[PDB]
Amino acid sequence: TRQEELAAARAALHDLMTGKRVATVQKDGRRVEFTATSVSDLKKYIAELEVQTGMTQRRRGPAGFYV
Amino acid sequence: TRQEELAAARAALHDLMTGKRVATVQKDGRRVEFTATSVSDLKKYIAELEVQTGMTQRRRGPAGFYV
Amino acid sequence: TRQEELAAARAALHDLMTGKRVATVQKDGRRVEFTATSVSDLKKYIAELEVQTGMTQRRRGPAGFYV
Amino acid sequence: TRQEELAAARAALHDLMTGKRVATVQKDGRRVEFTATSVSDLKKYIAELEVQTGMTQRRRGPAGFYV
Amino acid sequence: TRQEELAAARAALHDLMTGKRVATVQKDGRRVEFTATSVSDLKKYIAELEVQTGMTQRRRGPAGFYV
Amino acid sequence: TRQEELAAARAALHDLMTGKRVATVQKDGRRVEFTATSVSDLKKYIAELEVQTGMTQRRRGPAGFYV
Amino acid sequence: TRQEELAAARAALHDLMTGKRVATVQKDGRRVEFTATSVSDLKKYIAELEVQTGMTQRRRGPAGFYV
Amino acid sequence: TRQEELAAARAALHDLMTGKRVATVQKDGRRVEFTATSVSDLKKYIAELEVQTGMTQRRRGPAGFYV
Amino acid sequence: TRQEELAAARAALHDLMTGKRVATVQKDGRRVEFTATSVSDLKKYIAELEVQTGMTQRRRGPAGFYV
Amino acid sequence: YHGGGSGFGGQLRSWNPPSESVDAALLPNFT
């Protein structure tokens, strides 16, 4: 089910990025306050689930030098 | 009860990661709050219980060197 | 869908920078707010997908030196 | 009575870790808030009484080198 | 009265650790709040009260060496 | 009144560090707030008060050495 | 007017240390608040006024050394 | 007219020192606030207005040495 | 026309430091407040206006040395 | 003298070598 969260997380990343991550929605007599996380650690979660996901290559073996 | 504990904590990360961990909930005259745990600390907790339980290998012993 | 993702980000930077990043709204008990985002990370976010998408070259590589 | 409260402490950690550490609860004019601890302090705390009780090994006498 | 003093501290530790040490209580017209003390302070206090009281050995002297 | 005030201070320290240093008290239409002190300061106050008091030995004159 | 001054100041130190220095009082419309001091400054004030007053020697000179 | 404030400020210090420096007082719509001053600057203000007035000697010209 | 402000400043200094610089007033619908200055700058302010005013020398220059 | 007795402020207060014959000090653990 990796793609589900992967798509959800990146959508959340974009959602949080522009303006839409709502930490609290208020209706009279009904307050629900979510928690919020930073962008960095959010990317770290993005940075982890996709690599363990069998998607395309995103990393390379250092870099050698030749004269 | 480790296996479901793994599922619970791992899911607890995901919903918190995107937007869905409820810091507090208020209905008029009846509201409750929960201590907002961090994100880094949870992953150590996430990392802790997976290795100790019967879950498969995820890390190996250092790395040698050969010419 | 990167292009519209980029396009949304472009307006997201411009509107936030000038006056238009709406912190919260309040319709007489129907109120909602959004988690604030920094400016650098948004630029970083807008930086990465810019090259990541099929957009043209924007940063070349190193720099030579000749007498 | 060490063992049962040890499990309860472990449970409380799990409850605290995901979402369940209730900080305060409010009724119509009836509210109470409990003091909130950290996570690491609990982790070392639970570690303290598991070694003192009779459960299995978790610590070993350093480590030696042979060749 | 040190023994029950330790027992109270013993109780005052575990309940504080998990969820029970209430910071304050409100009863719609009557409320009282209590100063919150660090977990470290309890452990120091309970330990020094433990060693001074009539209970048995907990910590021995410094360790020596021999080939 | 050395003994009386020293015992009172010790009891105050005990209740404070356990759960019972009443920060402020409010009954509808009235409220008072007793100031809150630290714990190390209270402990050193206890120590100086007792060493000043005519109680028994609590300290020793450094320590010697001998083969 | 120094002896009763020092006695009152010492009593104030004692009650503040234990539980009994009220900072804010309020009676359903009439309330007062007092500026709160530290403990170390109060103690040094006690010390300096005590040494200035007619009370006898308390602090002696530097210690010598003999073989 | 320098000794009046000498007495006033010195009396204010003791008033400030114990419990009595009223930070603010409110009575059902009639409320005023007085800015607070720390003890240090207060004492170091006490430290000079008396020496410039006809108060007795309180400082001595360094200190000599003799075998 | 500098002496009166000098007189005003030191008069403002004295009551402000003792108890009597009103931070804000309240008349149930007619309330105001003022910015609170520190005591360090005020002493500088009174000092600089003190010398510039027609008052005589207060601080001499350097210091001689002789055997 | 002073050195052999007790030592400078304790020092070798507890050091009490049991003067015996060399055989009495060697033969026991000679092997």
CATH code assigned at A26: 3.30.1580.10
CB contacts of G8 in chain H (<8 Å) are: 18
Rg (CA), chain H: 18
Judge: F67–J11 Cβ closer than 8 Å, yes or no. yes
Beta bridge pairs of residue A44: none
Q: Using CA atoms, how far apart are residues H8 and H11, in angstroms rounded to an integer?
A: 5
Q: Which of D12, D29, D33 sits opposite E24 (nearest CB)?
A: D33
Return d(Cα E9, Cα F14) in angstroms, integer: 9
Structure tokens at E67: 């080939």
**Sign of torsion, CA A51 A54 A56 A61?**
positive
Structure solved using which method?
cryo-EM
Return the SS3 of A21.
coil
What per-residue string of b and e applies to I3-33 under the rule 16 or more CB within 10 Å gives b?
eeebeebeebbbebbbbebebeebeeeeeee
Token pair 């005052």 is found at E12
Q: Report the residue from I18, I36, I40 with minimal CB separation from H8.
A: I18
Contact A34 B13 (CB under 8 A): no
Domain-embedded: residue B33: yes
- Using CB atoms, which chains have 3+ pairs under 8 A with I? H
Q: In which domain, by residue range, is G19 found? A: 1-57
Number of domains within chain A: 1
C-alpha torsion angle, residues I15, I17, I20, I24 (rounded to 10): 130
β-bridge partners, E44: none
Q: Is there a contact between A24 and A30 (Cβ–Cβ < 8 Å)?
A: no
Closest residue in chain B to residue D29, using alpha carbons only: B29
Residue located via tokens 């996570």: D39
Q: Is residue G42 part of a domain?
A: yes
Give a yes or no: residue D30 inside a domain: yes
CA distance D4 to C66: 77
Torsion of CA G16, G19, G21, G26, to 10 degrees: 170
* Strand pairing category for A30-34 and D22-27: unpaired
Question: Are J14 and F64 a contacting pair at CB < 8 A?
Answer: no
Using CA atoms, how far apart are residues C50 and A58, in angstroms rounded to an integer? Answer: 17
Residue C56 in contact with residue C49, Cβ under 8 Å? no
Phi, psi torsion values for F29, nearest 5 degrees: 95, -5
Residue D33 contacts residue E22 (beta carbons within 8 Å): yes
Helix or strand holding residue C64 (H, E): none
- Label residue E18 exposed, middle or buried (CB < 10 Å: 0-12, 13-18, 19+): buried
Quote the radius of gyration of chain J (alpha carbons, Å): 13
| Token pair recorded at residue D14 | 């799990």
The residues that bridge with D30 in the sheet, in sequence order, are: D27, E27
Distance in angstroms (rounded) separating the CA atoms of residues I42 and I35: 13
Whose tokens are 């607070």? That residue is: H36
- Within a domain: I36: yes
Q: Which residues of B touch D36 (CB under 8 A)?
A: 35
Domain assignment of residue E62, yes or no: no
Give partners of A (≥3 CB pairs < 8 A).
B, C
Which resolution in angstroms does this entry have?
Answer: 3.9
How close, in Å, is residue H14 to chain I by CA atoms?
Answer: 11
Separation CA E36–CA E15 (nearest Å):
13
Q: Which of residues 38-67 of F touch J (CB under 8 A)?
A: 64-67
How many beta-carbon pairs under 8 angstroms link A with B? Answer: 51
Q: Is residue F48 situated within a structural domain?
A: yes
Cα B23 to Cα B27, C25, G21: the distances in Å are: 14, 20, 37
Supply angle C-alpha B38, B40, B41, rounded to 5: 70
Name the interface residues of B facing A (CB cutoff 8 Å). 13-14, 16-28, 31, 36, 39-40
Query: Minimal Cα distance from F64: which residue of J?
Result: J10
In chain H, residues with a C-beta closer than 8 Å to the C-beta of G22 are: 19
Alpha carbon of G19: minimum distance to chain H alpha carbons (Å): 13
Place of tokens 């170390």: G40
Contacts with J5 (C-beta within 8 Å, 6 or more apart), sequence order = none
Report the distance separating Cα H10 and Cα I14, nearest Å.
Answer: 12
Instruction: For residue B18, give the nearest of A9, A30, A31 by CB distance.
Output: A9
User: CB of I49 within 8 A of CB of I59?
Assistant: no
Virtual torsion, Cα H24, H29, H30, H32, nearest 10 deg: 30
* Residues F18, E12: C-beta atoms closer than 8 Å: yes
- Which residue in B14, B31, B39 is closest to A5 by CB distance? B14
Q: Which of C21, C22, C24, C35 to mutate to test the interface with A (most CBs of A within 10 A)?
A: C35
All partners of chain G with 3 or more CB pairs under 8 angstroms: F, H
What distance in Å separates the CA atoms of residue H26 and residue G32, rounded to the nearest whole number? 6
Q: Which of J6, J8, J11, J16 to mutate to test the interface with F (most CBs of F within 10 A)?
A: J11
* C37–A26 CB contact, under 8 Å: no
Pick from F51, F56, F59, F54: which is nearest to F1 by CA?
F54
Q: List subunits contacting chain E, requiring 3 or more Cβ pairs under 8 Å.
A: D, F
The first and second tokens of residue C42, run together, are 């948004």
**Residue among D1, D21, D24, D37 with most chain E CBs within 10 A, to mutate:** D37
CB–CB of H24/G33 below 8 Å?
Answer: yes
Distance CA J14, CA F64 (A): 13
Q: What are phi and psi of H4, to 5 degrees?
A: -65, -55
Within a domain: C66: no
> What values do phi and psi take at D59, rounded to 5?
-130, 145
Q: Exposed, middle or buried, G18 (CB in 10 Å: 0-12/13-18/19+)?
A: buried
Residues 6+ apart with CB under 8 A from D34: D22, D23, D24, E19, E20, E21, E22, E23
Report the DSSP pairing between strands G22-27 and G30-34: antiparallel
| Cβ F43 vs Cβ E48: under 8 Å | no
Which phi and psi angles does D35 have, rounded to 5°? -65, 140
E29 to chain D: which residues are within 8 Å by CB? Answer: 29
Report residue C59 as tokens.
């940063």
What tokens were used for H60?
């001595």
Q: CA H6 → CA F47, F56, H50, distances in Å? A: 37, 45, 7
Q: Mark E2-12 as b/e (b = at least 16 C-beta within 10 Å).
A: eeebbebbeeb
- CB of B35 within 8 A of CB of D23? yes
Distance of alpha carbon D28 from alpha carbon B31, whole angstroms: 10
Is the CB of J3 inside 8 Å of chain F's CB atoms?
A: no
* DSSP H helices in H1-67: 3-18, 39-52
Q: What spatial distance separates the first Cα and last Cα of chain J, rounded to whole Å?
A: 38
Phi, psi (rounded to 5 degrees) for J17: -65, 130
Q: Which residues are H24's β-sheet partners?
A: G33, H33
Evaluate whether residue H39 is within a structural domain.
Answer: yes
